[PDB]
């Protein structure tokens, strides 16, 4: 019904909070957060990056593979005959 009223039934949870003025917008932002970078940046990086690396090779790989194929005619047949 009324969006919040009839949502669900919940029992014996307790919540604790302050006015925003009670605290600061940078509670050791640098110091505390900078480590957190790794645990997330390491978490997925196992799962994600490598496929692209393969691509990047192909990028140069085929290009190079392309390049000779045309660029030099006096290659397979040199200009002799």
């Amino acid at each position: 019904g009324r969006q919040f009223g009839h949502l669900t039934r919940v029992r014996h949870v307790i919540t604790y909070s302050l006015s925003p003025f009670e605290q600061r917008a940078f509670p050791h932002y640098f110091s505390k957060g900078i480590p957190n970078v790794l645990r997330r940046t390491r978490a997925c990086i196992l799962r994600v990056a490598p496929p692209f690396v393969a691509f990047y090779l192909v990028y140069t790989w085929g290009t190079q593979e392309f390049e000779k194929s045309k660029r030099k005619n006096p290659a397979a047949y040199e200009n002799d005959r």
Partner: peptide
């Protein structure tokens, strides 16, 4: 004198 909140949610 602390601006804050307290919530104990019980639906019974």
């Amino acid at each position: 004198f602390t601006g804050s909140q307290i919530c104990h949610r019980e639906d019974g």
